């Protein structure tokens, strides 16, 4: 039972499937962006993620965002209402794969059903707050004649399209006064950039990635960041003293747990122990709020039992005769493991037969423009690009750039900015 | 020296011809 | 200068020490009810699909609240970076020496060179790291009609250079080496520099290594009981819960370990295979380009009158290429398994038995203390503790990481038998040192002498002594015996006038004891005993003796090989690759088998005994019968030709002569003849019922001489297919053998004369091994000249017609033989043929 939504870019504002929100990072400015609801909870604005960046990072330079991406610039993406229909349509068919099994359909089912606490570690234990960027977004009413009204609704997920760089998918999560209550168990709205047709490649003969696994990887981190267990804790950074050292980012245990296989083996038993007893010490947390507030200070429609028994089901705290929460450390272990090692990049690849990369650190090779993937010819709900009457489940041959030539473009090295180091001698 | 090969060749040949 | 391009992605990753967590050395607190803590991210994706209290069963609330109004945020900034960043380095590793195997897309007309430094200099110049044959031969142009061959000789070359993977012998105990590495990336510590094999041999894995990371290990912490004052039950549960929680820290540091080790050093071995492969691409590329180049410099008339097919060239390289990235991907992966398993895990081990000791002493006080709240039971307890930390946690990879590729390789690695070794005694500089890899202290005392073929003596005196400390963080014997001992020996010959002390005087030779308890090698006369002493005192022997009553020995004062194995159920002791002795042990409990090692006579010998030895070696296993002979054959190799107690044959040194197809004959030279009759040997004349020899230094003596210092000399050793000349000396003078050129029967007697040149005789010996199993026997061949192919004969004993018509009086001579020619032809080759010669020099370990 997940409804997938329809709808074209151009349908009317309706105030409901269709509104027009002002989201997270535009500041209650009055930036209002026509955004769709694809299902319970989850919204599409079909537009470029601007937030953050500056307007000519846009288009390709001499420099480069990430030095471990070939990256693919484009300013033009999104830029008419009939490409940010193409979009729109392209992420209902995306959702329409995930959907098609049970297990991205849990997926959806646990995003959609882990609303946010009402509050973060500001508000007070007594208390359910509504009134902070990560549990509410406005969206504007002003219907014709009748003049223009501000309401407010909960979220789950917001998903733009791209910023600058077409090929980098990323999930955010939101900071006020430098904490975050997507890592400390409350959990907070999430927002998604996201491209579906420049994809990226990988070897383990060249293969291009299932869009649909793309954002089933993205999802899991929206889904941890819902749950407030988004991981901040000791990571894997690179030694950079010496010139034959790669430089690169911090890892943190999360990605290389959500990305699964084996790769968490460079994650240390006392760092995963850490982890989780962080995540578990948070929970705690939340069961003695439930057991605790009273008042919804900043929305007096708000039902406090139906919310604590919402809470409750979310964190599958238990209740006792007598009303009071707490955490039955088998249900807690059960959900902890579900939801940071259940699901994986890894075990739904294998599940929905995509093909994936090896690694978490398999090199990144340039990325590759699907045609189309609204021509059932070359994509489809059930099989991807690896469809039986094409000839092309065998092998994933649906996804080998020998093989499938015709679902896929190269993109010329010029768009394309790269890392490189120039060693120089004297 | 020269002499005493000569006298033990004869010596060889002769116990090679037994 | 020059810059080179490089991609981030083939930089070295390598985790900063900072990236692992120093949580162990933290303090526990151990209660009645403490559980040991493990996470398992391995998931059973078909529970979560079915669990059905996963999703939720409540009503999601209504999206609609009030407007927000606090609009707080930190909002992200992202900025662009260079997409160029410039280094300055001279220095010269697998970057530059990759770009060194390149060349410009406007070039066409290559040449391979050895000179890194040219490749670098000159864009037509490209670097090869194979054979500087290899080399010359792609340098090569040919005629037309020649052209042909050559290509496929090179492409054949290039195959056979690629596929290259062993050291200059297998004596260095190397599992698999490709050796060209080194040349190929000049990784780690300037690996193209030198003779690469040799430098790994003396520091194995560790040489490839671009940096060598700083480990964290660290101090565990102390575990902190809790008192249940007057409750046994729980004072029992908190003794059995720091006991699991013990464990508990030995998995987490192996984790730890195990972290270290995929994050530091095995992406170090990983950027090196992926090195290899683009280095032998390059290679290929190259000599493709050249082969193209000189196929287009020939006329359209040439070109017609040569068959060549390019894919065919290219799928044959590439064949090549295959080949050679497999053994590169075995060795390296044995290198970074190695790596892990001698210089990462022993050093978590030491500190996890510095835990183990002081929660050991921790948990027996903490048992005291609650004597009185535990009466009578306080000492069960007691020995629960002491028996339990007793058995030292085993490190299994697949506990950590479930990835098939790193199980297979630590399989491999545990099933190579060199990855056994637990010392190696090696002569290096004067010195003895362990070459395991586990850095045994060895501490050699001067009165031991050396010597660069690897052998050592003890003698009598107080300071002939070898002490090996050994690594006390290796396990071995986890539960049962399993380990082995192989050494070479040689032991002199009783002294006739003291046989009865060297019947019943033993003495100890290596002693290794902890406790009093241990094993020791001994010897009592003509016997070597193998002794095993348990924890309880429990002792029990396993022997060779070998007999003094033969006339000739193939023991005694010469060189021969052990081998003991211990296993669950027996001590055996094998010589020489066979099986010779074996003892149930069944009844033996623990025997510590780490203490010091202690090379030394020990016991009541005469001022005068020694022993040799050579090739010491332990491994932490029981070899099989095939491992066994396997390195007795090994071992045994030498370029040079051996004497009859084993040691390298050399000229210019005075021998008699043994004969292995006659051994109690020896060559006379007959009165007032010039030939060599063959008499019988003495004996043994006096009483004792111990003993019985033939005399060895009895006949002539004799002496090699080289035919010519045409070639480089530098030392006196004979080798295999020299051309020498065998001489002896008659009286004060030098005497020569020789074969007469007219020859005309199938056997000769050899003419035994003075030094002269003269047309009529061949004076020429080239000497052979014919046999391919070891043996101190060589045959000697007589050629027609040294260029020559045609052979003459083998010279060896043979029985002539002396007299007599109606009985035939026949003697053995001294002869050169054809029926000897084809004889040596035959397989397996017989070991007692009478062309199967011995040189025998006085050695102060024989006397009659
Ligand atoms: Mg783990």
Redesign the interface.
């Known amino acids: 039972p997940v409804t997938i939504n329809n709808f074209n870019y151009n349908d009317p504002i309706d105030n409901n499937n269709i509104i027009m929100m002002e989201p997270?990072?535009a500041?209650?400015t009055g930036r209002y962006y026509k955004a769709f609801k694809i299902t319970?909870?989850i919204w599409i604005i079909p537009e470029r993620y601007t937030?953050?960046?500056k307007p000519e990072?846009f288009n390709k330079?001499?420099?480069?965002?990430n030095?471990?991406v070939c990256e693919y610039y484009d300013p033009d993406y999104l830029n008419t209402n009939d490409k940010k229909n193409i979009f729109l349509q392209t992420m209902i068919k995306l959702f329409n794969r995930i959907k098609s099994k049970?297990?991205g359909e849990?997926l959806l089912?646990?995003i959609?059903?882990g609303?946010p606490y009402l509050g973060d570690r500001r508000v007070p234990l007594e208390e359910f707050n509504?009134?902070?960027?990560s549990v509410?977004?406005?969206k504007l009413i002003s219907n014709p004649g009748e003049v223009e009204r501000?309401?407010?609704?909960?979220?789950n997920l917001i998903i733009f399209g791209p910023?600058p760089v077409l090929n980098e998918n990323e999930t955010?999560d939101?900071?006020?006064?430098?904490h975050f209550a997507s890592r400390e168990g409350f959990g907070g709205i999430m927002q998604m950039k996201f491209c579906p047709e420049y994809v990226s490649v990988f070897n383990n003969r060249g293969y291009f990635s299932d869009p649909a696994l793309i954002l089933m990887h993205q999802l899991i981190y929206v889904l941890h960041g819902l749950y407030g267990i988004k991981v901040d804790d000791?990571?894997?950074?690179?030694?950079?003293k010496?010139?034959?050292?790669?430089?690169?980012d911090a890892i943190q245990a999360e990605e290389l747990?959500t990305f699964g296989?084996?790769d968490?083996?460079?994650?240390?038993?006392?760092?995963?122990?850490?982890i989780?007893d962080k995540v578990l010490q948070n929970f705690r947390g939340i069961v003695d709020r439930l057991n605790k507030v009273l008042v919804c200070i900043?929305?007096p429609?708000?039902?406090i039992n139906?919310?604590k028994?919402?809470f409750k089901?979310?964190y599958?705290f238990v209740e006792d005769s007598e009303g009071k929460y707490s955490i039955d450390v088998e249900?807690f272990d059960?959900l902890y493991?579900?939801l940071?090692?259940?699901?994986?990049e890894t075990?739904i690849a294998?599940?929905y037969k995509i093909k994936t990369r090896a690694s978490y650190?398999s090199?990144?090779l340039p990325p590759v423009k699907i045609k189309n993937l609204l021509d059932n010819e070359i994509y489809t709900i059930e099989e991807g690009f690896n469809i039986s009457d094409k000839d092309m489940e065998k092998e994933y041959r649906g996804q080998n750039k020998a093989i499938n030539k015709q679902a896929y473009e190269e993109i010329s090295k010029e768009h394309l900015?790269?890392?490189?180091?120039?060693?120089?001698?004297? | 020296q020269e002499d005493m090969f000569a006298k033990l060749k004869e010596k060889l040949f002769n116990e090679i011809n037994k």
Do not use: H, W
């Open positions: 997270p990072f500041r209650g319970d909870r937030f953050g960046y990072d330079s001499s420099g480069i965002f030095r471990d049970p297990l849990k089912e646990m959609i059903n609303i509504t009134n902070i960027a509410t977004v406005n501000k309401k407010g609704i909960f979220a910023g955010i939101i900071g006020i006064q430098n000791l990571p894997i950074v690179p030694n950079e010496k010139f034959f050292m790669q430089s690169t747990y296989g084996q968490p083996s460079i994650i240390t038993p006392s760092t995963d122990k850490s989780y900043s929305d429609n708000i039902n139906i919310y028994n919402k089901d979310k599958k249900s059960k493991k579900s940071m090692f259940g699901f994986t075990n294998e599940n650190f090199d990144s900015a790269v890392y490189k180091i120039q060693m120089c001698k004297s």
